[PDB]
Amino acid sequence: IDIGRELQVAINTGKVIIGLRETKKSLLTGAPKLVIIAANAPRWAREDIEYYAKLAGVPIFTFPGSSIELGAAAKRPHKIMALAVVDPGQSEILKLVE
Amino acid sequence: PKEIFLVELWKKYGEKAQVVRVKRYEDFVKLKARLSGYLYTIRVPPDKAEQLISELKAKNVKVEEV
């Protein structure tokens, strides 16, 4: 499975939300499908994501790289602490939950 | 010394004044209430000034021209 390539497909086809603050808003107020958090996320940012995700009943996948490599896997030129996949437009990114 | 801009607020201080001093200019008059703690000063129009001196004299407050 190519996490990045599917994320690029879901980036361009469906709806993916970039940034920790948008993700907390999309977890708290929206209904996302998959949350991806970088492995090297800080303690406050990690535990905020799991608690809102545990309340929201949304799964979390821990990306096997850092925030920088997560951003490169999504083709962005910056870092990405956490993202929400609201719509997998053509990708199989929802396979990561299992 | 303190400066006050509303005559309603200054009347509360000036009525208790031991002495009210008056300094006259063309466009305004300086009214200075000398209390035990502070000296309260207001700048009023000349027409307002002779009015304020009038009741303060009726309140028995000393009015002294400087």
Partner: protein, 83 residues
Amino acid sequence: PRPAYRSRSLRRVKVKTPGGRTVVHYEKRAKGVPKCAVTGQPLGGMNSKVYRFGISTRAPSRPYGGVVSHKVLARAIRYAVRR
């Protein structure tokens, strides 16, 4: 008196008096503002310049007041909610 003015503990201020002279006044420097107990940064609403001790400084209307900033307080409350 005099060697207490040759040290830089006070501020040398020059002022022209109504009598036409120029004199040097020696005034105190301000005391440091309250800081947060976590980051050490100055606290909003309590950081105005104060030059003598014994002056009351009204803290912001929040729990814990002028002890921690709003960032430390809100985050700590989040931990207590989950804990």
